[PDB]
Every structure is written in structure tokens, then in C-alpha cells.
Design a protein around this ligand. Structure first.
Ligand code: SF4
Ligand SMILES: [Zn+2]
Lengths: 208, 760, 309
């Protein structure tokens, strides 16, 4: 229910994204998706310098335009390693979004580091036990509404930080608290299912 | 890539070739085997020049006698640089394939303005001033005195070339104009004179139309040209206009004033030198009586004021004694100038034939045509014998003498128009004489009759039979190469109906309609809001465009258009126009929509090319009919009708369509380049008007898109953009519009290629 | 001073946190604040209009955003404002002059040339202001037995299992459906008893309303102390891993701050429970986290000493 007015400022948005992703670790991929409705943008400074900065920072940017192809956006996507596409209809929009859901291939410059992660259980305390300590969730403290005093939950194995939501990296020690299904949730990408052989029924002399 | 074309090997520098390019090569080979002139039409951006260069190199390597030396004619300097770069790429490909450097020499030719290195002459803004200064510093008589006096002004650049550059020819290779300048600086020589001396050595010589088409400049090149050489004309669709302009003469009252002042000064100098050294006049008289062969053939370095316009037979005869004396010729020129001014004092426009004016001059000024034939030669001898350096002030004098000589020799096909008042503003007395030439074929006449063959091609050659009539020759082959596309990169649309269903037209009667102005404004606003950044709009005339812009500004629509995309409009001055074009291109490359508003006859349609993101949208506002008030246009139409049965209206329509196609044909650089073509006029729906379009363009003009509206055009543009904005692969082109190495060997592909092109 | 104080007024909790940290001598303000530490368009004249109200009202509404845009696009307006406002003429007077000047109302060959030149200059000003890896796995079986440890996959004996496999193969070979034998009243009663509330399967039940056992003021104070402890521990673990001597000193300072915070704020809060005799071990989580931090630091000290042994 917002108001759509003014013009896009791709330079400022890309600068904000670069500043946000400046401190991210190298092994983590930096990906930017841009939805460009208008064909023109206003930039307070040279955008090609920002393109060089993104290239040096190894940030991937992909753009899906709405009306037609933009040469500057095309160059930006090609140099940053991203893909540029154009909307044909709502179905094609969904197809492009689904295609961009899938992880992009890692370039040669992609790092390979041994990251350490913790996997706490759902520590639930029973009030009958003398060891039931209700405590407000750290994530729930971030909000304006009063945090819910939950008897148990998930506690960080590194610093005993209490969180009610997973998988979320621990804010205190920076440890990424995950669960085994979360890691296994992307295993299918590791072993994609190849397309099967198509043979019409009349040509297939076997089971019906 | 190696190509087998009728048993002739072609070293194609790219891994892929268009089938139309193969047909182009085959047709060029067949024309060469007949050693005859031919006309072919190829779509722009398809690398026709590359195929031409490859086949010419194959002919030169296989049969040096068939192609002794290559001649290439161009339009603008950047095109020359592009051709040089492409030929350099081809030579590098040849070297890589063979492993050895070929004994192949290529040369590009231009003026001293593009080839002078003297630091004093560099800041000069005009070539004629550059030429005068260079001649002052490099006059043959001045050179001898400078040999006896080093302190005299001089150009060491030419001196070292004369001393050293003559003996050793430049090594075989391809040199650009800046490369020529760098070589001259390294060797201390001038690239202009060195290049002209080395033209005899270069296998390929590339320059513009003016350097050879102009009879005043023809001998500057044709002297080192044999009969086995072949000349190439690229994008010569307006070559007739070039010939007419080169053979046209204009004179004003200020020209008469300058000529009279220079004549008085010259007579004073003649008297002064006669007081100082009268023997120079006697020696000049000795040269004249003994013959002009001794004077002309002894100094090639004084070719600054050469006038080879006359036939070679006329040059043999000497000047009659009635004007051999310097003072006699001074009186001759004075009387001629006074008669010219008196005849120009007429207050109304006068239409005359050259024989009639010659008869009138003979009756009044007692001057015969035979002495007037040698007017320039005597002027040349007089100017050269007086050690004159500042010949720039003699420009009106030489112009008038050459015009008088043209009257004395060239009569048929010429019209004398005397207009004392301007066409735009008759209220100001502007006495102008036009010696308009209506026979362009004569200008191309010797080229057909001297060289083995002449090559003419362009992307806008819709009527295949008008050119043989205009140039008065029979091309051996006349084939149009149809364009085959695996992806439809062009969407030509015609919109003659406005938003309010107003009939859209560009006739001068309807040009002042405010309704058409507002319809054009609405169409432009929708295009800016829809079409990508690149927008160019070609109007019919500068005045109409300015009036329309003023109306749009007053209407207030122009503000919204500027909000959508930035607005750029050219003006008369090229310098500010160049800055505007640079700003437009930078805005297009900076992601902010830029809109250009130019005229179909402005500089934009002449030598400005568009990249894919520059030629996104080209809109022509109406059929660009020339303003008919030009009596020169009227005289040309009447002469062509009376000599070739050609309808004047047909010629006007053909010229307008050719100009429109030139404005539109530059929007595509290749298969991967897609652009939008819009014609905002209902007149294009006329079959004769519609049917006079190039075949490769008119073929994709779907009949369902004929005479659409603004909304229909916008929707079709959106659909075309979305279809053509989908990513595309060069592999998809294989077998449909592009051919691989194995696809060439397929005889079915050969049959398809033969069926693609058609001869008429 | 004034800048730092305004930040506290924006976030009263931070001011409360700052009061608990620096005023109570727990931490220094220096260490406190160590932790704490537009495009241009061509429509800036076309869109901007003199606002005329219903009845004779010039609502100019001279916002700085439009004025700054004009100054960036037109340095001439900036120069005139600097050389005139407010000495030669007032700012409102200058804007009125600009509205009434022929430069704004540009609206005949001379007029067309002027319009074209002004548009070209505007475009030039706008443009100038715009300037300023293939992978192949080795051990696939790791996925077949992933994060699951080795299970007790106990295998059967010798081929006699086949005999048992035969037994069922012969037991169910001649089978007849049965209805009465499926269930019994005693079995149903036992199942209900297992499913009866408070039973073996019905573990636990209703619990105690801890919300009422903890006062809302105590709830808010616990939230604030949790925020403080979280910030302190984030600073503590931020130094980790320790690779430079500076991190050791910073961690020592952080431990001292944590100890002072426990002495100053935690204990009276603890007594606040003890005076109210709250049975909820809300402090127990905080004590556990603090002791975990202490143990981690002391263990790392031991490791560093062993490296120095
Ligand atoms: S000799 Fe060469 S460098 Fe000297 S003025 Fe002539 S063109 Fe220029
Ligand atoms: Zn943690």
C-alpha cells in the first residue's frame, strides 16, 4: 500500500548495498537483485566507478527489467557476473524469479573456507524441575513489544545466548546456530536430477 | 576461415560468414571476370566491405595483372579510418595464417589539413589557409632561393622528404592518417607529399569522392592510375548530388568586390615587378609561345592551382596573342568582371543557357570562346610568374576565371540562374549566380572509360534502373541482396493516423497545422515514456522543426517529454551540434534517456552512425520532400525529363525516400543489433511511395502495420522490444542466418544462398 | 557534548543504559562511546510551480531541497543569492524576482534560438552535476549417513533367519481375516488408561502462570539487564578470537565491567527477588551466562599460559 513516485536512483541503492556487504566475509556470496520498472535513473556521481567498486568487491548483480533492455544495466550485469533478463508477462516473471531462486554457479574467485557452526537442541525447561529458568529471547528483545518470557528454547552452545527462532546466527559470538535439516535442505542442489528419456507409448514396448 | 568461392580461396578473418556475404563475394567475382562495371545493394552492418576487401586481396594475390592496384572512394574521414582498421585486421589474419608478412602496401589519402605537421600551420582553422601557407613555405621558386638563403620561411618537412623520402619507398603495409603523421615526424617528412609520391607503390589507395570525382582534383590522383585499376564507390546513393555540387558555381557581390580589389593589387604588383624585372614577363611570353607542355610537365610541385577540367585535347593549343600579354589579360579580366557585374545588376531572376550567355558576351565584350577556354592556364602562369605566396586572396579571381572557362567549354546540361534576392528573405539584395550542372554522368564518364571496372554499392538503392540512366552507363550486373534474419531485428511501422484520427502529413501546406504539431508531440511523449533511451527524430526542414519545437514549448508538452527523457536539438553550427551529439551519446551511455531532434538533410543523416543502444528508435516525421522553390531543382527536373523522360514528381519522391532510408538504415550494426523504425505520415501508404523503399527494409514492412495510430504503434513497439529483449545466442543463428565451416560445404546451403539474392 | 546528549534523549533506554554503565562507575564514557562509534533530475524546474491556493495565496513553501537542486543545477542562482541575499535584497524578494524575471519565463527566431540555447545549457548543467568451479565429490556415502551417528543396526544370526523368514512366509500363506481377536475390552481399558489425562502417555499438564509470579516492573528491569549483559558479552566475544595483545587488555576491561555490573545492578535486583522471595530463577540464566564467559576467559588464559610454558 505504498506510494510510487519519483525516479529510481540505482547509484544510491547500489552504494547502500555495497556498504552493507562491504564487511561480509569473502566466502559468503554477495548477490543483488534489482527490479527496474522505469528506463531512466538519476545518479549523483559516476556509476561506472561504482561498477568498478562492485567488481573489486566481487559482488554479483542481476537485473530483470520490465519494459525493455537497458545498455548500462546490461553492462553492469555482464561485468558483475550477473544475468540480465526482461519481463514478457507475469508467467515469465515467475519463471525468471524461480530461476533466480536457484544458487548461482561459483566463480573461480570464490573462496573455500572452513566455517564453524553450532547445532543446539530445543532446550525446554519444565516448571516441575527446579532448573526451569524462563528468559526473554534475544531476538524478541530487539522489538518494541514486550518479549515473551519463555521457559525454555534454544541456547547458544558458545555463549548460552537464548533464541526462539532458528536458523539464526548468534548475535553475541557471531556463531551461526543451524540444524541438520537446514544443511540437508540444499543437498538436492549437490546432486541434481537429470532429465529422463522421452519415448512415446507406441514406441515403448513395455509396461503400461 | 578459408572459403572456396568458384575455385578461388578467400581468407575470411572471422569464424563465421553470412550467406548474403557469400553471395556478395560470388557476384563481385562474376563482375570481375567480365571486367565490367556493376551495381549491387547490400544491407548496412553486414560486413559487405569486409567481403569486398577479402575478394580484392584474393584477386591481387592470385592474379596481380587482373588487379594491378585497388582504388577505394569514401565519404567521411571516420569511414576511411574504419576501412583502414578493417584492412589491417585482414592483413594481420593473412600473416597469422601464412606465418609471413605479405608484400602488401595500403595507403589512405587526405588533404594537407589532415596531413600537415608544420607547427605554424597547425593552429590554422581552415584548410585553404593551410594550403596557402604550405605553398608559401614550399614554393618551388621559393625553395631554390631558400637553398641560397636558409633564413627564408620554409617547411623542413617537405625538404627532408624531397632529399631522402623519394629514393626509398615505404615498406609494404597499412598506415592510418595518424600513423602517417607519426611516420613523417619520425622521418622528418610530410605525410601528404610522401603519400602522394608513394601512391604509385601502394596496392590499395583509399580516399573520398571529392579527391577524384572533381575534375579540378581528378588529375591529383588519376596521374598515378592505370587502366587495370578498379574503383569502388561505397554508399554513393547521393553521388549525383556530389557531382552537381562539384560542377556548380556560385558568385555574389562580395566576391566581385574581393576580385576587383585583388585585381587592382595584382596590376599594381605587375607594374612594380616590371619596373624591377621586366624579363620575367618576356620569359613567360616565351613559354606561352613555345608551348604549355614545357611549363606543365617540368614542375609537379606547383600543382596547387591545377585545372584539369578541360579535355586533354584543349591543353595542347596555345593562348591567342590577343591576351598573351600580361596587361592585355588584365584588361580582359577587368572587362569580364565589369560585364559580369552589369549583367548581375538585374533585379529579377534570369534563366539562361550557357551558349546564349556566351553569345551575349561576344556581342558586348568582343570576347570569343576559344580564347576564354585557356583563361585559367594564363591565370595560372601569371600567378606563378609573379612569386605570389598569398594566393588565398586570389580565390574570387580564380573562381571567376574558372567559371568563365566553364562557360566557354561546357554548355550542354548547364543552366545559368541569376537570383538577386534570397529565396528565404527576398527583401535583402543578394545577387547570386548559379551555373548548375545537370549532367552528372560526364563527371563519372572518364572513370568508366579509363579503368578496368568501377564498383558502386550502397544500402539505399531501391530503384535499380534509375542509376544507369543518371550515370549514362550499363552496369554488367544489377543484383539486390535480400537480408535473411533468424531474428527479426527491425520493426518498420507507419503511423499516419493521430490520436484524434487526424491525417498525418508533412506537406508544406499541412506543415503549419497545429493539430499535426500536437499529434507529433503526443507521439514523442509516448515514445519517450515507452521506447528505450535512444531516440532520434528526423524532420523535413530546419524551419519547420524550429516552429514545431516552439509550439511544443508553448503548448507545455515539451516539459513532460524532457521529464521522461533528456532533450537535445541540433542547430546550424556543427561545432555546437557536435557537442550536443556528444552530450546525447554520454546521456545514453549514462542510463538517462536522451532525445535528438534533427533534420533529414542535416549533418546527422550524413556521417553520424548509431550503436545498438544509440539507434534504438528512429522516427521520420513525414516524407522529406525538398523545398520545390529551388529553380536549380526545377531546372534539374526539367532537364532530366527532357533528356530521360523522368517525371519530376517521381524524382522528388525517390530523393525523399532515399534520404529517409539513409536516416533509418544506420540504426543496425549487425544481427545482434535491433532497432525501431517509425514513419509518422499517411503518405507512405501510397504504393509508389511505399514501393520505393530498399528491398531488405521494405520486405519486413508488414502490411498489417501500414498506417497505424499512436497507440497501435506504441503497443507493437512494446511487443517488439520484449520479443527482441529476450537473450539470444550466436549458436541459434547457425543454419538459419549464420553459417559454420561445414555448413558452407552443403550444396543445399549453396542453393539457398543463390535463391537469397536476385538479379534484375 | 550537545551532540552526544541529543543521542541519549532519542533513546531513553540507552540513557538508562548509559546511566547504569558510566554514572555507576562500571564503565567509562570513553569506552561507552568507543562501542557506539541524492540524485538530480531535469524536472527540478518543470515540476516546481508557484502554488496558488483557492483564494489569492502564493504558498511558495521554499524548501531547501528544491533550492539546493537549483543551486547545484544553476550556480548563477547561488551566486546571485550569495551576492544579494539578504543585503541587496531579501530572500523572498530574490525568489519573487526569479519568478518574475525573463530567465524563468523564457516564453520569433530569436526566441527559438534562446529557448534552444537555454535547453542545451540546462542539459549540460544536468550532465555536469551528475558527475559530482567444477566440483567432483569423493565420499558420497557421507551423505547417506550424514549428521546421524552410527545407529545400532544389529544383524540377525545364521541362515536360520531364512527359516524364520519361511515361518512367516508359511504363517501368512494361509490367512483368514479376524475381527474379535483384533481387540479386547481389557486391551481397550489399558489403552484408555494410557491415554487418560495425567497418565503415562499424558505427560505433564497445566503449568504455573509465571507471568503473575514476575512483576511487570521486574519484567522490564530484567529485559533491560538482559540488554546490558548482551551488549557487554557481544563486546567480549567480539575481541575473540584473541590474536593481538590489545584484545587481551580489552577483554580484561570487559570482564571488569561485567563484574562491576553484577555488583551494582544485578545484586540489588537479585535482592529485589529475594526480598520478594520470587521462586523463579530468572537470575540463574544471567548467572550461567556470566559464569560461562568467566570460564571461557580463564580457559583461554590457561591455554595462553601453557603456550608460554
Ligand atoms: S610541407 Fe607538410 S608540414 Fe609543411 S606546411 Fe606543407 S603540409 Fe604542412
Ligand atoms: Zn553465542
Amino acid at each position: 500500500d505504498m506510494t510510487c513516485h519519483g525516479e529510481p536512483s540505482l547509484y544510491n541503492s547500489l552504494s547502500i548495498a555495497m556498504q552493507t556487504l562491504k564487511h561480509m566475509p569473502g566466502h559468503t556470496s554477495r548477490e543483488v537483485l534489482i527490479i527496474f520498472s522505469s528506463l531512466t535513473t538519476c545518479d549523483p556521481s559516476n556509476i561506472y566507478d561504482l561498477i568498478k567498486t562492485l567488481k573489486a568487491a566481487k559482488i554479483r548483480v542481476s537485473v530483470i527489467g520490465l519494459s525493455a533492455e537497458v545498455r548500462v544495466c546490461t553492462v553492469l550485469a555482464r561485468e558483475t557476473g550477473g544475468t540480465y533478463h526482461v519481463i514478457l508477462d507475469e508467467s515469465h516473471y515467475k519463471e525468471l524469479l524461480t530461476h533466480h531462486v536457484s544458487p548461482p554457479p561459483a566463480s573461480s574467485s570464490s573462496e573455500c573456507s572452513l566455517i564453524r557452526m553450532g547445532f543446539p537442541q530445543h532446550t525446554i525447561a519444565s516448571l516441575s524441575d527446579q532448573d526451569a529458568k524462563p528468559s526473554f529471547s534475544m531476538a524478541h528483545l530487539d522489538g518494541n513489544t514486550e518479549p515473551g518470557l519463555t521457559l525454555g528454547g534454544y541456547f547458544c552452545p558458545q555463549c548460552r545466548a537464548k533464541y526462539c527462532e532458528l536458523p539464526v546466527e548468534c548475535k553475541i559470538c557471531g556463531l551461526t546456530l543451524v540444524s541438520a535439516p537446514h544443511l540437508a535442505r540444499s543437498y538436492h542442489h549437490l546432486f541434481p536430477l537429470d532429465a529422463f528419456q522421452e519415448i512415446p507409448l507406441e514406441e515403448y514396448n513395455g509396461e503400461r | 576461415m578459408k572459403l572456396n568461392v568458384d575455385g578461388l580461396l578467400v581468407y575470411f578473418p572471422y569464424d563465421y560468414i553470412y550467406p548474403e556475404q557469400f553471395s556478395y563475394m560470388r557476384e563481385l567475382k562474376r563482375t570481375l571476370d567480365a571486367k565490367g562495371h556493376g551495381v549491387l545493394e547490400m544491407p548496412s552492418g553486414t560486413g559487405k566491405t569486409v567481403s569486398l576487401l577479402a575478394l580484392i586481396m584474393a584477386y591481387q594475390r592470385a592474379y596481380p595483372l587482373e588487379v594491378t592496384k585497388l582504388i577505394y572512394c569514401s565519404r567521411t574521414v571516420p569511414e576511411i579510418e574504419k576501412v583502414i582498421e578493417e584492412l589491417r585486421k585482414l592483413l594481420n589474419f593473412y600473416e597469422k595464417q601464412e606465418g609471413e608478412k605479405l608484400p602488401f602496401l595500403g595507403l589512405a589519402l587526405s588533404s594537407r589539413k589532415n596531413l600537415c605537421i608544420h607547427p605554424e600551420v597547425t593552429p590554422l582553422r581552415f584548410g585553404k589557409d593551410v594550403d596557402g601557407k604550405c605553398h608559401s613555405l614550399t614554393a618551388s621558386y621559393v625553395r631554390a632561393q631558400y637553398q641560397h638563403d636558409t633564413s627564408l620561411p620554409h617547411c623542413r618537412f617537405y625538404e627532408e622528404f624531397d632529399a631522402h623520402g623519394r629514393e626509398v619507398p615505404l615498406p609494404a603495409g597499412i598506415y592510418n592518417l595518424d600513423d602517417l603523421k607519426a611516420l613523417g615526424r619520425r622521418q622528418g617528412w610530410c605525410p601528404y607529399f610522401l603519400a602522394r609520391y608513394s601512391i604509385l607503390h601502394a596496392n590499395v589507395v583509399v580516399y573520398s569522392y571529392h579527391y577524384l570525382l572533381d575534375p579540378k582534383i581528378a588529375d591529383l590522383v588519376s596521374k598515378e592510375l592505370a587502366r587495370k585499376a578498379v574503383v569502388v564507390f561505397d554508399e554513393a546513393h547521393n553521388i549525383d548530388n556530389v557531382c552537381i555540387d562539384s560542377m556548380s558555381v556560385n558568385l555574389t557581390r562580395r566576391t566581385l568586390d574581393r576580385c576587383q580589389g585583388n585585381l587592382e593589387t595584382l596590376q599594381k604588383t605587375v607594374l612594380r615587378i616590371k619596373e624591377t624585372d621586366e624579363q620575367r614577363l618576356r620569359d613567360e611570353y616565351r613559354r606561352l609561345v613555345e608551348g604549355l607542355r614545357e611549363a606543365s610537365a617540368a614542375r609537379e610541385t606547383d600543382a596547387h592551382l591545377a585545372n584539369p577540367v578541360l579535355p586533354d585535347e584543349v591543353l595542347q593549343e596555345a593562348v591567342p596573342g590577343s591576351i598573351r600579354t600580361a596587361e592585355h589579360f588584365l584588361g580582359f579580366l577587368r572587362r569580364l568582371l565589369e560585364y559580369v557585374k552589369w549583367r548581375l545588376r538585374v533585379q529579377h531572376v534570369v534563366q539562361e543557357s550557357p551558349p546564349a550567355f556566351l553569345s551575349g558576351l561576344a556581342q558586348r565584350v568582343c570576347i570569343q570562346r576559344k580564347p576564354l577556354r585557356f583563361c585559367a592556364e594564363r591565370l595560372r602562369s601569371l600567378l606563378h610568374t609573379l612569386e605570389i605566396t598569398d594566393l588565398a586572396d586570389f580565390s574570387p579571381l580564380t573562381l571567376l576565371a574558372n567559371f568563365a572557362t566553364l562557360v566557354s567549354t561546357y554548355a550542354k546540361g548547364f543552366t545559368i540562374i541569376i537570383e538577386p534576392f534570397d529565396d528565404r528573405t527576398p527583401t535583402i539584395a543578394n545577387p547570386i549566380l548559379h551555373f548548375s550542372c545537370m549532367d552528372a554522368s560526364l563527371a563519372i564518364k572518364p572513370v568508366f572509360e579509363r579503368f578496368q571496372s568501377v564498383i558502386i554499392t550502397s544500402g539505399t538503392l531501391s530503384p535499380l534502373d534509375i542509376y544507369p540512366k543518371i550515370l549514362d552507363f550499363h552496369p554488367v550486373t544489377m543484383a539486390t541482396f535480400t537480408m535473411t534474419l533468424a531474428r527479426v531485428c527491425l520493426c518498420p511501422m507507419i503511423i499516419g493516423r493521430g490520436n484524434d484520427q487526424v491525417a498525418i502529413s508533412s506537406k508544406f501546406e499541412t506543415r503549419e497545422d497545429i493539430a499535426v504539431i500536437r499529434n507529433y508531440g503526443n507521439l514523442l511523449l509516448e515514445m519517450s515514456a515507452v521506447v528505450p533511451d535512444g531516440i532520434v527524430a528526423f524532420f523535413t526542414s530546419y524551419q519547420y522543426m524550429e516552429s514545431t519545437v516552439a509550439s511544443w514549448y508553448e503548448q507545455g508538452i515539451l516539459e513532460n517529454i524532457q521529464r521522461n527523457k533528456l532533450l537535445f536539438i541540433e542547430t546550424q553550427d556543427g561545432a555546437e551540434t557536435s557537442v550536443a551529439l556528444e552530450k546525447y551519446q554520454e546521456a545514453c551511455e549514462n542510463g538517462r534517456g536522451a532525445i535528438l531532434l534533427s533534420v533529414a538533410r542535416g549533418k546527422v543523416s550524413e556521417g553520424i552512425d548509431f550503436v545498438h543502444h544509440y539507434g534504438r528508435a528512429v522516427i521520420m516525421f513525414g516524407v522529406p520532400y525538398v523545398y520545390t522553390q529551388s529553380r536549380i531543382l526545377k531546372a534539374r527536373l526539367e532537364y532530366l525529363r527532357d533528356q530521360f523522360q523522368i517525371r519530376e514528381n517521381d524524382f522528388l519522391t525517390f530523393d525523399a525516400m532515399r534520404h529517409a532510408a539513409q536516416c533509418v538504415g544506420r540504426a543496425i550494426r549487425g544481427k545482434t543489433d535491433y532497432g525501431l523504425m517509425v514513419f509518422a505520415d499517411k503518405r507512405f501508404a501510397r504504393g509508389d511511395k511505399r514501393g520505393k523503399l530498399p528491398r531488405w527494409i521494405q520486405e519486413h514492412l508488414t502490411d498489417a502495420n501500414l498506417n497505424l495510430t499512436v497507440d497501435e504503434g506504441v503497443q507493437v513497439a512494446k511487443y517488439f522490444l520484449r520479443q527482441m529483449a529476450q537473450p539470444f545466442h550466436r549458436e541459434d543463428q547457425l543454419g538459419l542466418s549464420l553459417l559454420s565451416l561445414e555448413q558452407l560445404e552443403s550444396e543445399e546451403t549453396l542453393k539457398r544462398i543463390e535463391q537469397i539474392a536476385q538479379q534484375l | 557534548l550537545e551532540e552526544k546528549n541529543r543521542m541519549l534523549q532519542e533513546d531513553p533506554v540507552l540513557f538508562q543504559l548509559y546511566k547504569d554503565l558510566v554514572v555507576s562507575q562500571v564503565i567509562s564514557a570513553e569506552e561507552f562511546w568507543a562501542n557506539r562509534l541524492v540524485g538530480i533530475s531535469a524536472a527540478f524546474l518543470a515540476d516546481v510551480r508557484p502554488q496558488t491556493d483557492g483564494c489569492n495565496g502564493l504558498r511558495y513553501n521554499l524548501t531547501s531541497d528544491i533550492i539546493e537542486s537549483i543551486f547545484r543545477t544553476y550556480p548563477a542562482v547561488k551566486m546571485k543569492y550569495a551576492e544579494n541575499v539578504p543585503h541587496n535584497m531579501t530572500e523572498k524578494e530574490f525568489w519573487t524576482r526569479f519568478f518574475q524575471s525573463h530567465y524563468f519565463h523564457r516564453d520569433k527566431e530569436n526566441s527559438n534560438a534562446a529557448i534552444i540555447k537555454r535547453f542545451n545549457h540546462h542539459s549540460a548543467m544536468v550532465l555536469a552535476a551528475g558527475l559530482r568451479i567444477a566440483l567432483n565429490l569423493k565420499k558420497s556415502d557421507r551423505y547417506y549417513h550424514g549428521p546421524t551417528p552410527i545407529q545400532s543396526l544389529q544383524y540377525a544370526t545364521s541362515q536360520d533367519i531364512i527359516n524364520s523368514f519361511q515361518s512367516i512366509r508359511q504363517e501368512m500363506e494361509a490367512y483368514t481375516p479376524k475381527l474379535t481377536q483384533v481387540l479386547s475390552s481389557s486391551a481397550a481399558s489399558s489403552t484408555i488408561t494410557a491415554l487418560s489425562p495425567g497418565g503415562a502417555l499424558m505427560q505433564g499438564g497445566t503449568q504455573q502462570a509465571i507471568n503473575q509470579m514476575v512483576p511487570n516492573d521486574i519484567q522490564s528491569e530484567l529485559k533491560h539487564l538482559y540488554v546490558a549483559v548482551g551488549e557487554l558479552l557481544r563486546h567480549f566475544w567480539s575481541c575473540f578470537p584473541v590474536n593481538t595483545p590489545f584484545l587481551e587488555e580489552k577483554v580484561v576491561k570487559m570482564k571488569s565491567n561485567l563484574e562491576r555490573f553484577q555488583v551494582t545492578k544485578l545484586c540489588p535486583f537479585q535482592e529485589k527477588i529475594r526480598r520478594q522471595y520470587l521462586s523463579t530463577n530468572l537470575v540463574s540464566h544471567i548467572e550461567e551466562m556470566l559464569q560461562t564467559a568467566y570460564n571461557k576467559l580463564h580457559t583461554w588464559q590457561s591455554r595462553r599460559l601453557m603456550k608460554k610454558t
